[PDB]
Design a binder for this molecule. Structure first.
Ligand SMILES: O=C(O)CNC(=O)c1nc(Cl)c2ccccc2c1O
Ligand SMILES: [Cl-]
Ligand SMILES: [Mn+2]
Length: 222
């Protein structure tokens, strides 16, 4: 439960061996429920987008939209338990530093809160960072109480590079997930038939991010 102990005795060895690490009961029921309440309040007050355009119909009232998102800094009114989550994620990662491969983590994104609305949409197979944009670790926290994928779908399926197999991860309440963001971990979200919430942060590697600046391209006027 102390972040350093979880980091050294579980996350570091699990990440270095498998590139994927699942931590259940990360924050406990009380805090997890508070975060759920904050995310549902965001949803109920219209703070999410309308959802990824999945099917563009000739009649636009027929369009199908999928995952909805909102970006959260962690200090907004009504988001402070999400901020607490983000701090706890940061504490874990920082207590791994120097031991997650050869990466040196020096920053992260804001939190991306995602809501799959339960209409049979998921997320196609993809790699989070396929082109060297600086992101080395993906961290996802799940909020869905009593989630059963045989009933509601929504499994996260990862295809770790170099295996004739995949890893199915249920989006279970108070579950934290780490995985390498690059091509080692292509993954997909299978169709969700119930409202499915998750909060993602990506962590940056100092070297990769520093040279991403070059490739991706700040101008000083003359
Ligand atoms: O939610 C999950 O278990 C896994 N989700 C994703 O891998 C995922 N990845 C990306 Cl890059 C996006 C990107 C935008 C919106 C939602 C995403 C998402 O749910
Ligand atoms: Cl093992
Ligand atoms: Mn992804």
């Amino acid at each position: 439960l102390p972040a350093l102990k979880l980091a050294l005795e579980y996350i570091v060895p699990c990440m270095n061996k498998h590139g994927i690490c699942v931590v259940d009961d990360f924050l406990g029921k009380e805090t997890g429920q508070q975060i759920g309440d904050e995310v549902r309040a965001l949803h109920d007050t219209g703070k999410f987008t309308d959802g990824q355009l999945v099917s563009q119909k000739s009649d636009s009232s027929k369009d199908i939209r999928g995952d909805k998102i909102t970006w959260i800094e962690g200090k907004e009114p009504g988001c402070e338990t999400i901020g607490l989550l983000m701090s706890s994620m940061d504490d874990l990662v920082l207590h791994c530093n120097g031991k997650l491969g050869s990466y040196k983590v020096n920053g992260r994104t804001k939190a991306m809160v995602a809501c799959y609305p339960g209409n049979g949409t998921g997320y196609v197979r993809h790699v989070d960072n396929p082109n060297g944009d600086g992101r080395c670790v993906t961290c996802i926290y799940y909020l869905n109480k009593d989630w059963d994928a045989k009933v509601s779908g929504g499994i996260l399926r990862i295809f770790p590079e170099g295996k004739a197999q995949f890893a199915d991860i249920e989006p279970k309440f108070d579950r934290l997930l780490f995985f390498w963001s690059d091509r080692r971990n292509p993954h997909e979200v299978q169709p969700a038939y119930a409202t499915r919430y998750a909060i993602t942060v990506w962590y940056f590697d100092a070297d990769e991010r520093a040279r991403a600046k070059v490739k991706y391209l700040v101008r000083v006027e003359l």
